[PDB]
Amino acid sequence: DSVGNTVLHALVEVADNTADNTKFVTSMYNEILILGAKLHPTLKLEELINKKGLTPLALAASSGKIGVLAYILQREIQEPECRHLSRKFTEWAYGPVHSSLYDLSCIDTCEKNSVLEVIAYSSSETPNRHDMLLVEPLNR
């Protein structure tokens, strides 16, 4: 649109942290990436930016959206032909013990807007900055 938001941006804008809204946002956020790859496997959907230059990951961290943030970091798509869209990769399992590879591409001070930067430097008008350090690949 005129603001620069795409479909994956707008699902973050229309989230409001309630547990009913977290259900069908991340469910609808899931279905577009898979259908993005079927029509366009050459396309990378979450690299795109608006006029403020934010990615749909960092837009969820710039605002206070915690459920959309916890989903994108802990994202595994288990079915084949669209597994490369995952972010949390389990590596081995020996009964109880369950070892996982989280990913650190956009986060961890690598790019222009990393979510480790954007959470801490946010102007406290965006709520739940304190909450967004509780998710698993950041808090460790």
Binding site: A37, P41, T42, Q78, P80, E81, R83, H84, S86, F89, T90, E91, W92, A93, Y94, G95, P96, V97, H98, S99, S100, L101, Y102, D103, L104, S105, D108, T109, C110, L116, E117, A120, Y121, E136, P137, R140
Partner: protein
């Protein structure tokens, strides 16, 4: 905020700021290539369920700097 301001103040810390970088091969992308994406690590347990896992990267357990990937990968 202490951790971020220390990284901005030093360039040689930025090449050391790759916390658990490891540049690991993870899976197979389209057009048949390795993944090669920087990845962290974690540990948990589960006892209430039986802990069934659909997809597992390394069939053989532990992290002893030698692994063999599982045939669960499609490509």
């Amino acid at each position: 905020i202490t951790i971020l301001d220390t990284e901005k103040s030093f360039l040689k810390c930025m090449r050391k700021a790759f916390r658990s970088g490891k540049l690991l091969q993870v899976g197979y992308t389209p057009d048949g290539k390795d993944d090669y994406r920087w990845c962290f690590r974690v540990d948990e347990v589960n006892w209430t369920t039986w802990n069934t896992n659909v997809g597992i990267i390394n069939e053989d357990p532990g992290n002893c700097e030698g692994v063999k990937r599982t045939l669960s990968f499609s490509l």
